[PDB]
Amino acid sequence: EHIQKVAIFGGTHGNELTGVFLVKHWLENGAEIQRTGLEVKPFITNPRAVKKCTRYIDCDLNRIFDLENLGKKMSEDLPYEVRRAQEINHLFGPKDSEDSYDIIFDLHNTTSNMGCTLILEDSRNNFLIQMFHYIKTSLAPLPCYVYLIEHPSLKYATTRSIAKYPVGIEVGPQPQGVLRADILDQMRKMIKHALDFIHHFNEGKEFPPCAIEVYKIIEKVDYPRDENGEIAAIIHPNLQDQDWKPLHPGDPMFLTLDGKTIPLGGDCTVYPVFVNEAAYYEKKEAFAKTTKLTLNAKSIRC
Amino acid sequence: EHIQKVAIFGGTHGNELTGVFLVKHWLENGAEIQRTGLEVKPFITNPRAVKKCTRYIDCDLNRIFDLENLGKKMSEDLPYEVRRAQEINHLFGPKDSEDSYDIIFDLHNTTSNMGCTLILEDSRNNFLIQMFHYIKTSLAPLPCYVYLIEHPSLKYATTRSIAKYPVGIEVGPQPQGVLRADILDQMRKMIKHALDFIHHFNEGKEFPPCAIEVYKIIEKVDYPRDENGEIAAIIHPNLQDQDWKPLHPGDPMFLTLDGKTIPLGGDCTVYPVFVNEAAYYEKKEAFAKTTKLTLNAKSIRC
Numbered sequence: 001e002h003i004q005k006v007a008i009f010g011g012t013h014g015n016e017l018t019g020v021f022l023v024k025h026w027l028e029n030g031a032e033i034q035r036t037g038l039e040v041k042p043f044i045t046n047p048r049a050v051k052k053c054t055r056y057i058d059c060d061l062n063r064i065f066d067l068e069n070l071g072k073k074m075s076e077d078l079p080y081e082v083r084r085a086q087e088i089n090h091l092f093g094p095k096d097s098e099d100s101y102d103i104i105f106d107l108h109n110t111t112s113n114m115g116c117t118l119i120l121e122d123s124r125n126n127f128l129i130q131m132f133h134y135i136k137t138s139l140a141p142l143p144c145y146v147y148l149i150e151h152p153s154l155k156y157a158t159t160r161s162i163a164k165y166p167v168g169i170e171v172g173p174q175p176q177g178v179l180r181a182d183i184l185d186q187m188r189k190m191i192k193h194a195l196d197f198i199h200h201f202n203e204g205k206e207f208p209p210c211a212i213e214v215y216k217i218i219e220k221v222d223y224p225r226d227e228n229g230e231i232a233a234i235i236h237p238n239l240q241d242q243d244w245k246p247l248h249p250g251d252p253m254f255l256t257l258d259g260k261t262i263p264l265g266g267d268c269t270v271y272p273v274f275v276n277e278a279a280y281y282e283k284k285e286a287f288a289k290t291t292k293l294t295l296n297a298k299s300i301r302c
Numbered sequence: 303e304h305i306q307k308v309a310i311f312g313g314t315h316g317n318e319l320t321g322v323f324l325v326k327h328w329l330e331n332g333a334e335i336q337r338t339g340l341e342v343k344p345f346i347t348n349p350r351a352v353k354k355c356t357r358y359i360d361c362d363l364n365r366i367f368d369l370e371n372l373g374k375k376m377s378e379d380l381p382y383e384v385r386r387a388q389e390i391n392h393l394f395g396p397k398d399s400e401d402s403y404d405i406i407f408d409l410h411n412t413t414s415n416m417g418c419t420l421i422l423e424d425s426r427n428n429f430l431i432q433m434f435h436y437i438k439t440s441l442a443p444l445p446c447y448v449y450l451i452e453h454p455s456l457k458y459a460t461t462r463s464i465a466k467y468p469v470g471i472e473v474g475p476q477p478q479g480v481l482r483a484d485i486l487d488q489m490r491k492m493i494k495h496a497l498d499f500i501h502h503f504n505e506g507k508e509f510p511p512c513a514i515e516v517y518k519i520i521e522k523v524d525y526p527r528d529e530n531g532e533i534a535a536i537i538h539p540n541l542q543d544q545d546w547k548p549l550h551p552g553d554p555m556f557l558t559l560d561g562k563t564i565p566l567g568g569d570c571t572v573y574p575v576f577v578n579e580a581a582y583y584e585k586k587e588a589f590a591k592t593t594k595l596t597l598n599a600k601s602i603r604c
């Protein structure tokens with residue numbers, strides 16, 4: 001059924017600059033992101049954090065789009081981002097209402113070496129699975145991985161979760177507060193292909209069943225802390241930059257300043273992602289342990 | 303003349319983590335940085351910026367070690383880093399007194415792709431030139447570059463400039479707020495060799511005249527800005543990560559989102575350094591243009 005309202009959000013985290021740059025340019029000339037019979041609105045979600053070139057002002061914008069915050073009485077005392085979440089929800093939602101935007105792409109960067117990443121929230125979601133498959137195939141031979149979040153709560157609080165079909169776009173490695181040409185080119189391409197898909201679907205194109213490989217988070221792995229709770233070992237050079245690649249029971253994982261290796265253990269293979277992400281220091285995380293699985297989509301047709 | 307007081311400073315910028323990690327470990331176990339008949343003191347220069355994992359709190363510590371700040375009446379209303387500069391200057395200085403520390407290494411990281419870098423402030427400084435030559439030779443085949451700052455004011459304001467022999471140690475690429483193993487192993491190797499040098503000098507070893515190549519900044523090059531003063535093009539993919547390598551009048555330098563290349567121009571070769579450093583966005587700088595020159599040292603002997 002016909003897709004009408006599409007947004008591309010940038011600056012959810014103010015120091016992830018690829019999104020900010022694109023959206024700002026598109027707000028002056030949207031030609032690249034328009035499709036015949038499709039309105040795409042670019043929007044900067046966190047202006048204050050973008051001016052300060054900072055992750056957030058008062059709290060993470062990408063973690064509060066839920067009934068607890070979006071439903072509390074509007075007030076000058078409320079943390080900036082809460083205040084902002086309610087504005088965004090009024091513009092592009094209300095979340096869960098039939099009037100809400102159909103598809104939102106929320107753009108993000110990581111310091112991890114992940115390349116092009118799509119983030120999926122519903123594991124049972126044929127339309128989005130189909131889209132991700134289309135993107136994957138278009139980027140080839142450029143790799144493109146799909147990261148799967150499966151809350152047994154069935155609830156999400158991400159900025160994009162306003163949409164009927166939320167799409168997370170993440171590209172790394174890029175230092176925060178830095179704009180790399182290569183990274184910008186990758187994200188552009190992903191967007192170009194995502195919009196091609198929407199457009200083709202709206203033109204009534206048929207899509208046979210398809211399958212994608214996804215990586216589902218099973219555990220946040222923390223750094224070894226010491227007596228005082230301080231980081232006591234660091235990501236081993238062998239693991240560094242090896243996001244998505246298999247890591248076995250034997251393999252090096254941490255290195256201590258005194259020079260010893262701490263190996264994986266457990267007794268099956270895992271797929272580290274978000275290996276050494278800047279934002280995951282404070283929030284105690286060296287990487288995420290993921291399982292690799294296949295999702296299937298039924299054929300779809302508008 | 304005999305070198306007694308040596309300091310290694312970490313956390314001058316709170317979110318350059320290599321220095322912070324080493325210094326903190328050394329404060330628990332200094333064995334690796336001790337030498338026979340040589341006392342080396344590790345110190346964390348910017349504790350609050352290190353706790354908040356942030357470049358600074360009120361202003362850049364590395365920018366205010368000068369008469370204008372170091373000489374103002376101590377009070378609780380002074381910017382934190384000013385207070386802290388006074389504390390530091392009294393512990394390891396007073397800057398310009400005969401009692402001040404002899405050598406200070408200030409540890410730093412850059413998001414630029416510079417590898418191991420030594421920063422020199424006096425261009426006419428035999429003892430330092432001799433040291434840098436030793437460290438370069440020692441590291442080889444690992445590359446190691448010397449960056450030369452030459453103020454016609456004759457005045458410096460860096461944290462390390464308290465010492466009779468200030469030494470800047472910078473290693474990249476590393477995103478802020480991230481600890482990479484390879485980068486840590488590089489910095490510690492540089493330190494290991496610097497301290498070997500001092501030790502050998504103290505043992506009365508002779509050093510013949512020597513020469514090093516250095517890179518002296520001639521101009522901070524800014525991003526093209528638009529009518530509103532906003533960044534309008536970005537570091538060209540060809541220039542990205544090509545710190546130290548020669549860039550000629552023809553060569554690509556910036557890329558616009560609309561896809562055009564902005565070439566170097568002028569009419570001689572230059573050596574880009576600090577290409578795309580996070581800290582230099584606000585501070586209006588895409589990279590530093592440098593000339594390559596040769597410094598000569600007379601023979602030295604304790």
Ligand SMILES: [Zn+2]
Nearest residue numbers: 013016108109
């Ligand atoms: Zn983000």
Ligand SMILES: [Zn+2]
Nearest residue numbers: 315318410411
């Ligand atoms: Zn620094």
